[PDB]
Design a protein around this nucleic acid. Structure first.
Ligand code: MG
Ligand code: MG
Length: 132
RNA sequence: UCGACA
DNA sequence: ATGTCG
């Protein structure tokens, strides 16, 4: 019951909070479709959110109806709400991620999409295909 | 008091 | 260890 015709996203970090990156891959083949340049300070959940929204934009611009898989219960909710409820402090070190998060929410408030955003069931299926 | 997803 | 939700 894995929908193989899908995009899978995941975050990678060093520290949490710490250096965050994310990527999107074809669930079937593992082909890397997008990979964000490391952001110097962010949280896991912020990254997971940015990964989903990147995915939405990526599929929309390509006229693709594929669903997105994420393993992140938090990020799935934040995208549904159009609001990333992060605790991360705001300062000059966290300005970049917070700018990206604000711009992701703005995108969600200005665009439509029909893309199903699905939970990857790790306990049944193993690590998501985009894992680091 | 946890439980869960990372 | 921390970041987050039910
Ligand atoms: Mg993940
Ligand atoms: Mg992972």
């Amino acid at each position: 019951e894995i929908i193989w015709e899908s995009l899978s996203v995941d975050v990678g970090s060093q520290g949490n909070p710490g250096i965050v990156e994310y990527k999107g891959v074809d669930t079937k083949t593992g082909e890397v479709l997008f990979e964000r340049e490391p952001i110097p300070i962010g949280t896991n959940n912020m990254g997971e959110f940015l990964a989903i929204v990147h995915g939405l934009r990526y599929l929309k611009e390509r006229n693709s109806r594929k669903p997105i898989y994420s393993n992140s219960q938090t990020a799935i909710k934040w995208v549904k709400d159009k609001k990333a409820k992060s605790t991360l402090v705001r300062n000059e070190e966290t300005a970049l991620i917070w700018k990206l998060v604000d711009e992701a929410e703005e995108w969600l408030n200005t665009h439509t999409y029909e893309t199903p955003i699905l939970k990857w069931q790790t306990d049944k299926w193993g690590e998501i295909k985009a894992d680091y």
